[PDB]
């Protein structure tokens, strides 16, 4: 089960400053599983 954090970005058309998009890496998922290894009921992953 997971929650997804939605975010909207408007592309004006001027390709000067690249937007900063939040990306979630595999590394982060492992870091998650290790902070909850002992939990006695599944934790919630917030996926952006």
């Amino acid at each position: 089960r997971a929650k997804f954090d939605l975010q909207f970005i408007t592309e004006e058309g001027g390709y000067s400053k690249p937007p900063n998009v939040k990306k979630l890496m595999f590394s982060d998922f492992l870091s998650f599983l290790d902070s909850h290894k002992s939990d006695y009921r599944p934790p919630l992953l917030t996926v952006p």
Binding site: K37, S38, D39, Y40, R41, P42
Partner: protein, 48 residues
Amino acid sequence: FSELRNFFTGDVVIRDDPFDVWDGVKATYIPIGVHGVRLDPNGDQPPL
């Protein structure tokens, strides 16, 4: 002289680099897995 040597001849085998020895370890166990709800097997108990 030969015989005197052959008497005082005996071999030994030793490890080139000494073993690296450690201390014991405190065997600590931690919880794992998720637990669900288990309902009583007999159901409601008789009155009084």
